[PDB]
Amino acid sequence: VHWSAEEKQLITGLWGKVNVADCGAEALARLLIVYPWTQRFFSSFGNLSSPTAILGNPMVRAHGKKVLTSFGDAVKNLDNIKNTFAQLSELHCDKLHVDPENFRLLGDILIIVLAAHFAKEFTPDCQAAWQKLVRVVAHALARKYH
Amino acid sequence: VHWSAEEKQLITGLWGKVNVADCGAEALARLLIVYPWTQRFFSSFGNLSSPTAILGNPMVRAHGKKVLTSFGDAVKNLDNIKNTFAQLSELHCDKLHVDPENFRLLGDILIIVLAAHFAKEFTPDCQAAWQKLVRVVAHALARKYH
Amino acid sequence: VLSAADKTNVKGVFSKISGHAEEYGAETLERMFTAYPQTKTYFPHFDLQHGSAQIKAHGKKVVAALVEAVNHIDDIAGALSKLSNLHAQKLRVDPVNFKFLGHCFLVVVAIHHPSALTAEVHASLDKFLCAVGTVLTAKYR
Amino acid sequence: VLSAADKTNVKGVFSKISGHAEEYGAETLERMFTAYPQTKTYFPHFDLQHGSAQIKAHGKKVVAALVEAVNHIDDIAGALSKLSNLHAQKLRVDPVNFKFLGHCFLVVVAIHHPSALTAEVHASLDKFLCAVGTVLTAKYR
Numbered sequence: 243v244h245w246s247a248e249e250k251q252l253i254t255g256l257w258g259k260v261n262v263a264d265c266g267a268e269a270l271a272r273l274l275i276v277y278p279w280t281q282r283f284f285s286s287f288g289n290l291s292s293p294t295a296i297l298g299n300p301m302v303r304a305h306g307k308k309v310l311t312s313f314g315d316a317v318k319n320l321d322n323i324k325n326t327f328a329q330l331s332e333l334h335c336d337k338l339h340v341d342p343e344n345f346r347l348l349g350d351i352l353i354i355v356l357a358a359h360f361a362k363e364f365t366p367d368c369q370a371a372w373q374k375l376v377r378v379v380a381h382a383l384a385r386k387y388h
Numbered sequence: 389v390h391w392s393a394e395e396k397q398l399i400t401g402l403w404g405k406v407n408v409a410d411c412g413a414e415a416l417a418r419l420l421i422v423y424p425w426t427q428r429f430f431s432s433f434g435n436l437s438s439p440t441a442i443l444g445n446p447m448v449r450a451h452g453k454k455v456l457t458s459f460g461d462a463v464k465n466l467d468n469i470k471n472t473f474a475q476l477s478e479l480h481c482d483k484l485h486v487d488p489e490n491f492r493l494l495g496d497i498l499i500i501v502l503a504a505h506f507a508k509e510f511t512p513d514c515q516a517a518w519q520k521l522v523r524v525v526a527h528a529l530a531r532k533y534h
Numbered sequence: 535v536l537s538a539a540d541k542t543n544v545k546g547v548f549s550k551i552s553g554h555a556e557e558y559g560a561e562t563l564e565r566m567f568t569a570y571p572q573t574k575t576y577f578p579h580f581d582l583q584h585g586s587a588q589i590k591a592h593g594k595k596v597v598a599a600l601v602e603a604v605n606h607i608d609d610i611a612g613a614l615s616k617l618s619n620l621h622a623q624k625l626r627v628d629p630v631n632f633k634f635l636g637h638c639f640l641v642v643v644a645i646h647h648p649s650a651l652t653a654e655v656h657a658s659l660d661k662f663l664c665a666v667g668t669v670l671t672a673k674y675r
Numbered sequence: 676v677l678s679a680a681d682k683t684n685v686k687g688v689f690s691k692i693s694g695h696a697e698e699y700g701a702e703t704l705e706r707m708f709t710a711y712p713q714t715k716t717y718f719p720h721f722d723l724q725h726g727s728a729q730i731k732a733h734g735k736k737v738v739a740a741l742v743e744a745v746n747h748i749d750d751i752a753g754a755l756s757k758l759s760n761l762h763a764q765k766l767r768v769d770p771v772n773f774k775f776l777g778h779c780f781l782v783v784v785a786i787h788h789p790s791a792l793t794a795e796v797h798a799s800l801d802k803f804l805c806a807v808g809t810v811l812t813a814k815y816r
């Protein structure tokens with residue numbers, strides 16, 4: 243729950259170069275493709291019958307942007323994370339009933355998606371900071387049970 | 389994090405009939421037997437080469453009592469759980485490096501161990517309350533990361 | 535992986551519960567719906583009230599499928615290939631739910647047949663339930 | 676379960692990394708030791724300093740074992756039966772650690788060969804890593 247000064251610069255510096263739209267769409271598309279059961283939650287997005295259909299689906303692409311924007315709010319409120327995700331926690335837990343393990347899977351997809359987008363710039367120390375950020379956001383969403 | 393009055397009576401009433409020693413030893417013995425990798429943490433207990441050796445090992449039996457006693461402290465401090473497990477959290481996380489998933493497995497073993505000890509008295513509403521208690525204790529131990 | 539020992543232990547316990555497939559199957563689903571409410575989202579068409587005929591009928595089918603898997607324990611993937619498409623392809627059941635159900639199952643046998651659920655049988659039975667869960671999610675795993 | 680499609684995708688990507696088994700193997704272990712410190716408890720005898728000869732040598736062995744599994748992808752359990760006893764019986768590696776390692780692996784290929792790690796290959800590669808993890812813990816699962 244405590245951030246070293248080094249971690250903040252590490253996540254912050256990187257966020258500024260993130261293409262929220264492309265990475266957002268790629269991360270969400272990957273969650274629906276490598277972990278198929280997650281598609282059950284997005285029945286309202288229409289066509290999700292093939293990887294291609296999924297990568298081409300505009301709603302998937304659009305929702306992806308919103309999710310990553312949501313991560314940006316965390317990057318700017320590194321210490322106010324609970325409040326920032328309070329209402330999202332209720333949506334996912336009480337209205338959707340998404341099991342917290344899935345938050346962990348999305349966070350990992352996001353890590354590998356950033357690695358492919360930054361390559362060597364995504365150093366081991368950098369990955370470690372982001373892994374932490376992703377676990378905190380996941381924990382802040384898995385609150386309604388706690 | 390909020391306990392209904394019905395849940396408290398449900399866990400409390402049951403705790404009073406718990407044979408801390410037998411259930412403690414049985415639960416710990418089962419963790420080492422159905423989830424073998426957990427034995428790595430108890431190398432100092434000596435002989436753990438067979439289910440029989442494990443069920444007969446006195447240290448396993450003795451440690452089992454301590455763990456269940458630890459659950460009793462939670463039953464008496466249903467609202468002060470964080471403090472009660474604060475130092476145990478540091479031991480398990482920082483000194484032992486036990487992955488939190490194992491806390492979840494021990495809690496389940498404990499649930500089935502209580503069912504075999506109370507039979508029908510362990511109603512679905514009763515199981516639900518205990519499942520919650522076990523998840524809270526697990527969460528309070530998986531804090532050092534949070 | 536299931537050993538000769540596990541196969542024996544599992545068959546041992548299933549002989550004792552074969553008689554009450556409906557009863558144990560219903561109790562298993564009710565405890566699941568009660569301790570893990572999130573699972574109710576897969577049965578919006580069901581009357582989830584305790585004792586409902588739908589739960590008794592389905593609980594029965596569920597244990598039967600389990601029995602079927604015990605009898606073809608050497609190739610559980612083939613014996614349940616149809617259930618695998620249903621759960622993984624059509625229903626898209628989140629894999630974590632199979633552990634919830636399996637746990638509630640162990641609980642009902644612990645309650646009705648404690649002496650039979652020894653530590654070792656528990657281990658064998660846990661391996662078996664995990665095997666079934668792997669096969670029913672097999673499609674996307 | 677590995678399909679004809681997955682087998683092809685996995686072989687595809689492994690052709691590209693076969694050349695750098697030591698390099699990728701070392702980076703994989705270092706990222707693992709850095710993002711999941713708890714894993715260091717399994718290597719008390721190792722010099723865990725970045726660049727250490729022990730990590731480079733071991734990282735090499737680890738990728739080789741992976742390659743061996745690709746080539747006998749139809750029976751991964753037989754090709755790795757010796758590693759399975761080591762990890763599950765002797766070492767008692769907690770199963771959760773295999774996912775950490777597998778994840779760090781996907782990360783190093785994403786970094787060095789992004790164009791090759793398409794969504795579908797990612798899925799195939801994820802299935803494969805999960806298969807290997809199942810086999811190396813197989814003894815007690």
Ligand code: HEM
Binds near residue numbers: 280286312379
């Ligand atoms: C751990 C990171 C996660 C974050 C930060 C996140 C963020 C978001 C955000 C910002 C929204 C609201 C969009 C809006 O109000 O317009 C949302 C909606 C939603 N999320 Fe998540 N989410 C996460 C994980 C998940 C997972 C794992 C699933 C599915 C298994 C999921 C399923 C949904 C669904 C179904 C909606 C509603 C979509 C719709 O409007 O049709 N989310 N999420």
Ligand code: HEM
Binds near residue numbers: 492
């Ligand atoms: C989630 C419930 C858990 C509770 C309430 C619990 C409780 C305890 C308690 C009370 C002690 C301290 C004993 C003393 O100071 O004399 C202890 C020690 C320890 N625990 Fe746990 N524990 C839990 C889970 C685990 C798990 C899952 C493992 C192993 C995977 C574990 C491994 C240990 C070890 C190795 C020790 C030290 C034993 C020794 O003194 O040699 N604990 N635990």
Ligand code: HEM
Binds near residue numbers: 576595599621625666
């Ligand atoms: C050991 C695991 C399980 C077994 C052996 C099992 C068995 C079955 C069987 C035999 C059917 C009925 C097929 C028919 O009526 O023709 C079925 C249907 C279904 N299963 Fe499972 N199942 C298992 C786990 C799960 C889990 C964990 C969930 C979700 C929490 C689930 C949700 C469903 C649903 C919603 C249906 C259809 C029910 C209906 O519409 O009548 N199953 N399952």
Ligand code: HEM
Binds near residue numbers: 776
């Ligand atoms: C895809 C998974 C893995 C593969 C393919 C793999 C492969 C190997 C191989 C080939 C050996 C070396 C055998 C020899 O030198 O003769 C080995 C040893 C070992 N593995 Fe793994 N391993 C894997 C995962 C793990 C994980 C996740 C851990 C723990 C965090 C682990 C801990 C060890 C240790 C401590 C040794 C012995 C090292 C030594 O003393 O030199 N392994 N593994």
